[PDB]
């Protein structure tokens, strides 16, 4: 089919399309989180801005995945981007838990894709995910673990005060 | 009658004078809030500065309305600027509620004036309110909703602590 | 209900959620187009870049609609972003024609939302769409009509030499 | 024997020498292409420049491989650089096909060497090829596929007009 396609299996192409849809779902979930934390009755500009940046980073994710899909002579196959798991994300700890669960799911899908690249003997896929993704998600899951631990120390009956101090002093 | 006055009804002129008096009452209410929060027994330089800026923004409001009133060949019919509703504004949440109620009243008077401009077929009034006022009030009522939500999560038995964290970390 | 929400009907909120989903589908369709024109067997860097710009401008669109949805005390409700209607976009005229059809649909949904804002007497919605969207679409549908007229003018016994010169000299 | 040599098999050393000879043949083929497209009866200075830059990039390639061969305590063994496959490269599509086939052969030799490095458990070889070669060849085979697709759209009876417009507007 493609003239440039070399050592790029149908499984890796399909798993890259599946991962693109997953980064689109994640970017859309971080869009939903990012605008939920900007609701007037949620009002956490730093938590909004944090997920607005994660929506951008997951977009740089699907865009660089699609750039690689094209560089490998794969076809970008676009499935429906399913709606985010919640329309109301609860408090900042609950949303940061959902964000971590999502990012650990993306990191799982990357690790599954890297395992598939290793099984299909695709060095360029392995390099590309190692270069742009596996360290990005590990740094970001660490960052959200730092956030979750701070949000947990800021828990208790004082959680409203703690949620505010988290947003004002950790989130820019 | 005025030589420049075109398509500018007596109702729109009178409702612009009524709205000018409302923005004057609003600046005067934000003057009262701004200096109430600078009282030694209230002592919130950031809440004071917030309402001091709103007194200025409502003053640009009545000044823009008076600029437009004169640009349309209307007459600026001034009236008593009635005293602000409270002599003492209570706590920062209570004051921010009175402020958001005042901006929702001003936004109602803009929306009523825009409905009157639509009924009297006055495009320039509609443009002027849309350009200079309706977005300013919607942004500001959003900003006050954000403040009220933060002041609400900062409520409970720690309310004195939360009230001053709100001031230093939001209003700076 | 929201504390800040004033003069913002459930119909306008729902039509803004519908238009957000439509601007999301539009950005995702421009993602499909943008990465389709970067396929090795399509290879039109300026047509890919043109639809990457439209994906970015439709992303500014749904993000700005969501910022407004929040500023009005509306709740952003997120639906599935339906798959982008094609994975194979034909030649540049076929794609530019699908893009202009999408943008005339998206401008229709804006004009319908503005008609709904006019019917619900919502000046701030009218202002917001007029300021940020109705001129965005008219400039962009004009630009795509200009592109389609040039692509049709460049239609011929090859089509592909004209299509290359379109990408090289208009989209550059 | 080398004092620094660690975890660097005789197969990987010999396959790095074989790959150096392929990058030397590739530079020599891009020298032949580069000077053929500057030939007076060919006269495509942008196509000549494109193959000169590829002769340089494949030289940066064998020089990196030789620097790495030395860093690993391997011995650079130099074989004859076989003559490049044609004296006459034909039209720009024919030459770009010979180039894209040559980069697919060079990328195959990288992938074979990476498979050998993985089989010999050589992480530094894998890192080195991933860092400096596998992405360079994938980007370059993509770039040549983009060139070929433009050169095919610029094909048909128009032929020489398309060959000129390719060189003038893609290879500026």
Swiss-Prot record, chains A, B, C, D:
Gene behind this protein: FTL
Family: Belongs to the ferritin family.
Region (Catalytic site for iron oxidation), start-end ranges: 53-60
Function: Stores iron in a soluble, non-toxic, readily available form. Important for iron homeostasis. Iron is taken up in the ferrous form and deposited as ferric hydroxides after oxidation. Also plays a role in delivery of iron to cells. Mediates iron uptake in capsule cells of the developing kidney. Delivery to lysosomes by the cargo receptor NCOA4 for autophagic degradation and release or iron.
Keyword field: Acetylation, Cataract, Cytoplasm, Cytoplasmic vesicle, Disease variant, Iron, Iron storage, Lysosome, Metal-binding, Neurodegeneration
Species of the source: Homo sapiens (Human)
Major subcellular location class: cytoplasm
Domain Ferritin-like diiron, chain residue ranges per copy: 6-155
InterPro entries named in the record: Ferritin (IPR001519), Ferritin-like (IPR012347), Ferritin-like_diiron (IPR009040), Ferritin-like_SF (IPR009078), Ferritin_CS (IPR014034), Ferritin_DPS_dom (IPR008331)
Keyword Iron applies: yes
Location(s), subcellular: Cytoplasmic vesicle, Autophagosome; Cytoplasm; Autolysosome
GO CC terms, sorted: autolysosome; autophagosome; azurophil granule lumen; cytoplasm; cytosol; extracellular exosome; extracellular region; ferritin complex
Record GO terms (molecular function): ferric iron binding; ferrous iron binding; identical protein binding; iron ion binding
GO biological process: intracellular iron ion homeostasis; iron ion transport
Subunit structure: Oligomer of 24 subunits. There are two types of subunits: L (light) chain and H (heavy) chain. The major chain can be light or heavy, depending on the species and tissue type. The functional molecule forms a roughly spherical shell with a diameter of 12 nm and contains a central cavity into which the insoluble mineral iron core is deposited. Iron enters the spherical protein shell through pores that are formed between subunits. Mutations leading to truncation or the addition of extra residues at the C-terminus interfere with normal pore formation and with iron accumulation.
Name assigned to this protein: Ferritin light chain
SUPFAM superfamilies: Ferritin-like
UniProt keyword Metal-binding present: yes
Disease: Hyperferritinemia with or without cataract: An autosomal dominant disease characterized by elevated level of ferritin in serum and tissues, and early-onset bilateral cataract. Cataracts may be subclinical in some patients. Neurodegeneration with brain iron accumulation 3: A neurodegenerative disorder associated with iron accumulation in the brain, primarily in the basal ganglia. It is characterized by a variety of neurological signs including parkinsonism, ataxia, corticospinal signs, mild non-progressive cognitive deficit and episodic psychosis. It is linked with decreased serum ferritin levels.
Residues that, per the record, bind Fe cation: 53, 56-57, 60, 63
Residues found modified as N-acetylserine: 1
């Amino acid at each position: 089919s493609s003239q440039i396609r070399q050592n790029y299996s149908t499984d890796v192409e399909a798993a890259v399309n599946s991962l693109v849809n997953l980064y689109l779902q994640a970017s859309y979930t971080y869009l939903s989180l990012g605008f939920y934390f900007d609701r007037d009755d949620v009002a956490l500009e730093g938590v909004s801005h944090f997920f607005r940046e994660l929506a951008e980073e997951k977009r740089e994710g699907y865009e660089r995945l699609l750039k690689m899909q094209n560089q490998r002579g794969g076809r970008a196959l676009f499935q429906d981007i399913k709606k985010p798991a919640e329309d109301e994300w609860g408090k900042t700890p609950d949303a940061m838990k959902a964000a971590m669960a999502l990012e650990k799911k993306l990191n799982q899908a990357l690790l599954d894709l890297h395992a598939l690249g290793s099984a299909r003997t695709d060095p360029h896929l392995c390099d590309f995910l190692e270069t742009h993704f596996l360290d990005e998600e590990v740094k970001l899951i660490k960052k959200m673990g730092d956030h979750l631990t701070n949000l947990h120390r800021l828990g208790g009956p004082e959680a409203g005060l703690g949620e505010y101090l988290f947003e004002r002093l950790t989130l820019k």
